[PDB]
């Protein structure tokens, strides 16, 4: 129905330039305008301005008049935020949303967001480490096994305990940055009947470094 899928997350060293694309479907592009919003982590949601997909004319908000530039590939129904000279406080997530009415007071149907990690840091690819237990019956007739995905940059990382299949009783924890890199981990609990019996495998993909790992949590005990 309306779906606005956006570009994937972007890493860019300070002072650089980025064009974040947003492709519309469901509606007639020209009769609804694009609203762009900044959800910066420790602060909240900010309107950036709005563009008229019929005339092409952008409005900008005060805090955005200057490096932000709205542009549109009408012909493919795409709005793009271009940010120039990436001052570090542009580390945030940018949502494009369809402005219902004229000027975009009502944003109904939002896009999934794109995350700009403005950073001097280098891409480091991860260390996927199978954590089999020192046995320890983790609750009656259950065992919890783990997967430490250390030392990578930038975020994200896709983690699936066996190709999407161990779905219930998984806890992937948020990643945390230790100055230059992140450390992420997941747990999964299974009944004793299932492990070491079947093959639980950590299927970790670092898409920035073209890295896909499958560490089998082998019984080691």
């Amino acid at each position: 129905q309306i779906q606005l899928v956006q570009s994937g997350p972007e890493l860019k060293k300070p002072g650089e330039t980025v064009k974040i694309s947003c492709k519309a479907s469901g509606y007639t592009f020209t009769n609804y305008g694009m609203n762009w919003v900044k959800q910066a982590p420790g602060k909240g949601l900010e309107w950036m301005g709005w563009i008229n997909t019929n005339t092409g004319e952008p409005t900008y908000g005060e805090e955005f008049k200057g490096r932000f530039a709205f542009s549109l590939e009408t012909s493919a129904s795409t709005a793009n935020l271009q940010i120039n000279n990436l001052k570090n406080e542009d580390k945030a997530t940018f949502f494009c949303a369809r402005g219902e009415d004229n000027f975009g007071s009502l944003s109904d149907y939002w896009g999934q967001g794109t995350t700009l990690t403005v950073s001097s840091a280098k891409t480091t690819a991860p260390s996927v480490y199978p954590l089999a237990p020192v046995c320890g019956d983790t609750t009656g007739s259950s065992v919890t096994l783990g997967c430490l995905v250390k030392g990578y940059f930038p975020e994200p990382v896709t983690l699936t305990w066996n190709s999407g299949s161990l779905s219930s009783g998984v806890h992937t924890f948020p990643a945390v940055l230790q100055s230059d890199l992140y450390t992420l981990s997941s747990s999964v609990t299974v009944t004793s009947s299932t492990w070491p019996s079947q093959s639980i495998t950590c299927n970790v993909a670092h898409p920035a470094s073209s890295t896909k790992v499958d560490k089998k949590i082998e019984p080691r005990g």
Binding site: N31, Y32, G33, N102, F103, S105, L106
Partner: protein, 389 residues
């Protein structure tokens, strides 16, 4: 004419819309002595059609345009001027003094009613042949209001709908029947409607239809049909799921004929409709939350069938453009088999949405109906709020 008018025809087949009138008032008013108006409309004499509208007593550019978002004051006045010229200081005729009007011509001459006053002690004065004849002082004492577009007369008799009371709840709406300025009778609003404001009215086959505004609970519009001859009326709602008021809840699958449709209380926008069986066309803003865009929809039988969804449409003002108030009018003296249906769309520029400036004026767009299928265009007010800074 030199004889009363009788609505002897029916509406013509409404198949598309052709532009009839364009003002460009705000665009030209950035460098001409133009008046700040709002609540515009169009009425025809036997002789000519004219744009009518409530002046604010200042030019867009003059420093007294500041704070013209306020609706009523002693500087407002019903004024009138040539079809499609701007409402200029030098070509406006003052019809009477007040902040609510209605004006119509009965075949012989015209009736204009301007309402004035403080909200708790207001009075209506009914001008006929440019002289005050009758006056009606308030009845419920909290803002006596009326049509905001032309009224319709049959054989001397003109029903005019007035509301006095609260816009948030039950108010005293009475239908007055005038003939030549004197009150012939008045009855109170009767029927299933729940609140009445700003009725847009047109007339055919000896009967008068008024699409009004439900300010208390309605998102579907209430309709008054007045027999001008017998001096009676009734009121029901527009059954159609195609909700036309604004702001509105999103349109349902099935709607409500004898009651207000729930969702947006204490709000509306004056609006109109052409109710003629298959040849019914409705108009709403395109936005559900705001007065942006304006579009026309053919919704066969929308008055009576409560699952009527639109079969043909026409975009009038683009959703990336502002609209405002709409109302019906026809040139009852034009030559032919039938009534060419027409309407207008106020184009509100200014405060509150475009508050970079402190004035609120508006422009006007008019269209009449074609039996043809003419292709469509959008019609923007057109000014750039940035050249007034």
């Amino acid at each position: 004419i030199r004889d009363f008018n009788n609505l002897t025809k029916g509406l013509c087949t409404i198949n598309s819309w052709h532009i009839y009138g364009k003002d460009n008032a705000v665009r030209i008013g950035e460098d001409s002595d133009v008046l700040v108006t709002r609540e515009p409309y169009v009425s025809c004499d036997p002789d000519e059609c004219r744009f009518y509208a409530l002046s604010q007593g200042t030019t867009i550019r003059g420093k007294h345009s500041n704070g013209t978002i306020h609706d009523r004051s002693q500087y407002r006045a019903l004024i009138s001027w040539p079809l499609s010229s701007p409402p200029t200081v030098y070509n406006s005729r003052v019809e009477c003094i007040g902040w609510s009007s209605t004006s119509c011509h009965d075949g012989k001459t015209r009736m204009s009613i301007c309402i004035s006053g403080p909200n708790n002690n207001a009075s209506a004065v009914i001008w006929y042949n440019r002289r005050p004849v009758t006056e009606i002082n308030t009845w419920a004492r909290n803002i006596l209001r009326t049509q905001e577009s032309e009224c319709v007369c049959h054989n001397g008799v003109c029903p005019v709908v007035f509301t006095d009371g609260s816009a948030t709840g039950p108010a005293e709406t009475r239908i007055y029947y005038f003939k030549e300025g004197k009150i012939l009778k008045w009855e109170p609003l009767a029927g299933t409607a729940k609140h009445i404001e700003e009725c847009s009215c047109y007339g055919e086959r000896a009967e008068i239809t008024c699409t009004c505004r439900d300010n208390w609970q309605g998102s579907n519009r209430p309709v008054i049909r007045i027999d001008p001859v017998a001096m009676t009326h009734t009121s029901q709602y527009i059954c159609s799921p195609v909700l036309t008021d604004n702001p509105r809840p999103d349109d349902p699958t099935v709607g409500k004929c004898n009651d207000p449709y729930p969702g947006n209380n204490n709000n509306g926008v004056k609006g109109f409709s052409y109710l003629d069986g298959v040849n019914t066309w409705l108009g709403r803003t395109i936005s559900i939350a705001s007065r942006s865009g304006y579009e026309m929809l053919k919704v066969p039988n929308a008055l009576t069938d409560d699952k009527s969804k639109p079969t043909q449409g026409q975009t009038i003002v683009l959703n990336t453009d502002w609209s405002g108030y709409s109302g019906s009018f026809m040139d009852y003296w034009a030559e032919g088999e039938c009534y060419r249906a027409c309407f207008y769309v106020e184009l509100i520029r200014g405060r509150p949405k475009e508050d970079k400036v402190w004035w609120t004026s508006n422009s006007i767009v008019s269209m009449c109906s074609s039996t043809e299928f003419l292709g469509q265009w959008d019609w923007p007010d057109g000014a750039k709020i940035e050249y007034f800074l």
